[PDB]
Scaffold this active site. Structure first.
Site, PDB file in Angstrom:
ATOM      1  N   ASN A   1      -6.142   2.467  -0.776  1.00 55.11           N
ATOM      2  CA  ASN A   1      -7.339   2.137  -0.025  1.00 55.11           C
ATOM      3  C   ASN A   1      -8.530   3.042  -0.366  1.00 55.11           C
ATOM      4  O   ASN A   1      -8.381   4.249  -0.496  1.00 55.11           O
ATOM      5  CB  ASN A   1      -7.009   2.207   1.459  1.00 55.11           C
TER       6      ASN A   1
ATOM      7  N   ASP B   1     -11.439  -1.773   3.818  1.00 58.11           N
ATOM      8  CA  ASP B   1     -11.545  -2.019   5.265  1.00 58.11           C
ATOM      9  C   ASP B   1     -12.095  -0.781   5.958  1.00 58.11           C
ATOM     10  O   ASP B   1     -11.839   0.345   5.530  1.00 58.11           O
ATOM     11  CB  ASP B   1     -10.193  -2.408   5.887  1.00 58.11           C
ATOM     12  N   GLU B   2     -12.859  -1.013   7.041  1.00 59.18           N
ATOM     13  CA  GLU B   2     -13.218   0.030   8.012  1.00 59.18           C
ATOM     14  C   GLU B   2     -14.000   1.185   7.374  1.00 59.18           C
ATOM     15  O   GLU B   2     -13.742   2.374   7.670  1.00 59.18           O
ATOM     16  CB  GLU B   2     -11.972   0.462   8.791  1.00 59.18           C
TER      17      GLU B   2
ATOM     18  N   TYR C   1       0.480 -10.084  11.835  1.00 61.01           N
ATOM     19  CA  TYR C   1       0.835  -8.678  11.704  1.00 61.01           C
ATOM     20  C   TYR C   1       2.057  -8.301  12.550  1.00 61.01           C
ATOM     21  O   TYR C   1       2.309  -8.842  13.641  1.00 61.01           O
ATOM     22  CB  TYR C   1      -0.282  -7.745  12.182  1.00 61.01           C
TER      23      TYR C   1
ATOM     24  N   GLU D   1       0.856  -1.171   0.000  1.00 60.21           N
ATOM     25  CA  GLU D   1       0.000   0.000   0.000  1.00 60.21           C
ATOM     26  C   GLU D   1       0.893   1.222   0.000  1.00 60.21           C
ATOM     27  O   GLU D   1       1.793   1.327   0.831  1.00 60.21           O
ATOM     28  CB  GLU D   1      -0.874   0.032   1.244  1.00 60.21           C
TER      29      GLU D   1
HETATM   30  C1  LIG Z   1      -6.701  -4.077   7.314  1.00 60.77           C
HETATM   31  C2  LIG Z   1      -6.365  -3.442   8.642  1.00 60.77           C
HETATM   32  O1  LIG Z   1      -5.519  -3.928   9.400  1.00 60.77           O
HETATM   33  N1  LIG Z   1      -7.055  -2.326   8.963  1.00 60.77           N
HETATM   34  C3  LIG Z   1      -6.804  -1.424  10.082  1.00 60.77           C
HETATM   35  C4  LIG Z   1      -5.499  -0.644   9.910  1.00 60.77           C
HETATM   36  O2  LIG Z   1      -5.803   0.180   8.799  1.00 60.77           O
HETATM   37  C5  LIG Z   1      -5.085   0.236  11.086  1.00 60.77           C
HETATM   38  O3  LIG Z   1      -3.685   0.526  10.997  1.00 60.77           O
HETATM   39  C6  LIG Z   1      -5.336  -0.494  12.400  1.00 60.77           C
HETATM   40  C7  LIG Z   1      -5.229   0.432  13.580  1.00 60.77           C
HETATM   41  O4  LIG Z   1      -5.279  -0.327  14.773  1.00 60.77           O
HETATM   42  O5  LIG Z   1      -6.686  -0.999  12.413  1.00 60.77           O
HETATM   43  C8  LIG Z   1      -6.933  -2.045  11.482  1.00 60.77           C
HETATM   44  O6  LIG Z   1      -6.035  -3.075  11.736  1.00 60.77           O
END
Ligand SMILES: CC(=O)N[C@@H]1[C@@H](O)[C@H](O)[C@@H](CO)O[C@@H]1O
Ligand SMILES: OC[C@H]1O[C@@H](O)[C@H](O)[C@@H](O)[C@H]1O
Length: 601
Positions: free
Chosen positions: A205, A266-267, A368, A164
């Site tokens: 994103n 996401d989100e 992660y 990304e």
């Molecule tokens: C796909 C993903 O991991 N999305 C989010 C990430 O964007 C963000 O850095 C994190 C913050 O705690 O939340 C989630 O993990």
């Protein structure tokens, strides 16, 4: 079975040993392929001694034989190979990639003493997507660091790198603020990935997490019922929204030239927010009837991007967390790969996604590495027999054809908490673990200690290092340009001052940087001024300053970028270089650099 990583899928042992002698040659006795030959010339050099590469003579005892036979594609696929360790070593594969992976194993077999027990294996990956992801957003991650990662990935047979990142935009210059990559830098990464048999998966994103693009486009931001804008969210009810995003996608795909596009997704929204977005509600119901939701409008927007990129022969991917069973009318197109990282609430389960016939990748949060945050616990994963069937929230009881693989993911959330070089250290064992889990051979040892020892013995890829991290002996130096030298100035500032005799104590750090300490004041060169993103000083033009030396301040760490006559100073965190400000000679951080000559003082 041999101690190699990833482990071979099977091993039929024999008697005796292959030994590498100075008589050995590398024999290419299949089809002509310039890529395979170039790779083989590097490989020949990565072994002890002086092996010649040939593609005209028959193989002999003691040789390493690389046999590229395209008719073997059905049996071995695009990446597999057949290895025989006998009186000679033979690697048979259908492709250049398969031969390359075979040679990664051979190097490991011969690493300790140039001898290998005899036997054979058909070695084909259990999963087709074997990945590392790097989020190079807000911050910039150097291209040299990426080259090292790609070499290490290739050495462990990982084949997919998600990035990304922001491409410096000609389409939308109002989005071109640091961090970004120039188009030439992107093409450099593209060239590297092709060389190391890695597929790049770029991301911008959308429709959430767009603050790095929408800062200067308030007209595109989603508003709530109260009328309040959400700076990171695109208003997907506006047609101009899709047009904006697909424009930026098109511009990035041209330079990345990848088969895949990852749009993130996401989100963005959850159902408990629906009373506060009646305009997304209205837009959805207008298009898809009385039961349609904002998530249907979301899914439709993604399907539109899918159709767009498929028009140029590309394929789409998304994160999973926006799939929460609330798209009542609009299913996600089935040829969109879903990367599953998060479970909970009504988020759709892995089993359900796989049953839908789409490609599903395991990108678990457990895999992660987060600056300043969670770190993948490789030991625990190994001890609990983690595999790609183990998704967050759900362990599948059997495999599936459409389970593509897995990846580890590197995130910069507290971006000044850790340098990229520290992250490089931390990812060593994660990388070997996901390579092992996705290639799919048996464990080399019951417990982690044996795995880790093997990994550290093998070490990094041959040819990994691409920099000299310690080009100056620790000591005191004047740093000069023309008639000027770097010196302390007003208000804890630092400048290029005419005729200054100022000097600096340079000392290497453990993570490949230097502290730069003023001999006058005893304080350390730092970046603490200007706009911050994710806690990191990322403003081009921000002044450098002097601060009390601190072992934890990563912004006090400087990379020495070398030339023959001079060097440049790069801030470890911001990745910007010390530059002279023309009006007042102040040292500021920019994407250019002032070239400084180091003179022992
Ligand atoms: C796909 C993903 O991991 N999305 C989010 C990430 O964007 C963000 O850095 C994190 C913050 O705690 O939340 C989630 O993990
Ligand atoms: O850590 C920052 C990152 O957080 C996550 C998100 O999906 C990315 O787009 C980026 O914002």
């Amino acid at each position: 079975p041999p101690e190699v990583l990833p482990t071979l899928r099977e091993w039929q042992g024999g008697q005796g040993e292959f030994t590498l002698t100075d008589r050995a040659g590398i024999v290419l006795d299949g089809v002509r392929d310039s890529r395979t030959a170039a790779d083989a010339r590097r490989f020949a050099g990565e072994l002890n001694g002086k092996a010649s590469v040939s593609q005209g003579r028959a193989a002999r005892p003691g040789d390493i034989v690389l046999r590229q036979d395209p008719a073997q594609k059905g049996l071995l696929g695009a990446e597999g190979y057949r290895l025989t360790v006998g009186t000679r070593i033979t690697v048979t594969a259908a492709t250049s990639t398969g031969v390359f992976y075979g040679t990664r194993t051979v190097l490991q077999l011969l690493n300790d003493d140039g001898r290998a027990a005899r036997g054979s294996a058909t070695d084909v990956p259990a999963y087709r997507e074997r990945g590392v992801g790097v989020c190079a957003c807000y911050i910039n991650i150097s291209t040299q660091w990426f080259e090292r990662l790609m070499k290490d990935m290739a050495s462990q047979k990982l084949n997919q790198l998600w990035i990304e990142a922001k491409v410096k935009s000609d389409t939308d210059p109002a989005s071109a603020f640091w961090g970004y990559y120039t188009k030439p830098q992107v093409r450099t990464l593209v060239a590297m990935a092709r060389k190391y048999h890695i597929e790049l998966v770029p991301e911008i994103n959308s429709p959430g997490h767009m603050d790095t693009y929408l800062e200067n486009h308030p007209e595109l931001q989603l508003k709530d019922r109260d009328g309040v804008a959400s700076p990171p969210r695109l208003d997907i009810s506006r047609p101009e929204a899709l047009a904006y995003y697909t424009s930026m996608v098109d511009e990035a795909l041209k330079v990345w030239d990848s088969r895949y596009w990852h749009m993130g997704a996401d989100e963005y929204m959850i159902g408990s927010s629906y009373p506060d977005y009646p305009q997304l509600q209205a837009a959805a119901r207008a298009k898809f009837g009385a039961s349609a939701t904002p998530d249907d409008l979301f899914t439709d927007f993604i399907n539109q991007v899918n159709a767009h990129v498929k028009a140029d022969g590309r394929s789409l991917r998304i994160w999973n967390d926006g799939l929460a069973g609330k798209n009542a009318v609009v299913p996600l197109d089935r040829d969109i790969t879903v990367e599953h990282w998060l479970s909970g609430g009504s988020i759709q389960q892995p089993s359900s996604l796989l049953a839908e016939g789409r490609p599903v990748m395991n990108s678990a949060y457990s895999l992660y590495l987060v600056r300043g945050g969670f770190t993948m616990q490789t030991q625990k994963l190994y001890e609990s027999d983690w595999t790609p069937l183990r998704f967050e929230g759900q362990t599948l009881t059997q495999g599936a054809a459409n389970l593509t693989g897995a990846k580890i993911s590197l995130w910069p959330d507290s971006a000044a908490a850790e340098t990229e070089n520290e992250v490089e250290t931390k990812v060593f064992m994660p990388l070997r673990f996901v390579a092992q889990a996705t290639w799919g051979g048996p464990k080399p040892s019951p417990t982690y200690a044996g795995f880790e020892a093997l990994a550290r013995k093998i070490g990094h890829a041959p040819g990994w290092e691409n920099t000299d991290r310690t080009p100056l002996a620790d000591g005191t130096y004047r740093l000069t340009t023309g008639a000027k030298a770097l010196a302390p100035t007003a208000d804890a500032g630092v400048s290029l001052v005419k005729n200054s005799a100022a000097s600096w104590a340079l000392t290497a750090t453990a993570d490949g940087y230097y502290t730069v300490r003023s001999t006058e004041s005893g304080q350390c060169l730092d970046a603490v001024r200007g706009k911050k993103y994710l806690g990191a000083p990322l403003e081009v033009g921000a002044e450098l300053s002097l601060a009390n030396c601190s072992t934890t301040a990563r912004t006090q760490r400087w990379q020495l970028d070398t030339g023959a006559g001079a060097l440049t100073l790069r801030n470890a965190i911001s990745q910007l270089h010390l530059t002279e400000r023309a009006s007042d000679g102040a040292a500021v951080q920019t994407t250019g650099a002032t070239r400084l000559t180091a003179r022992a003082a």
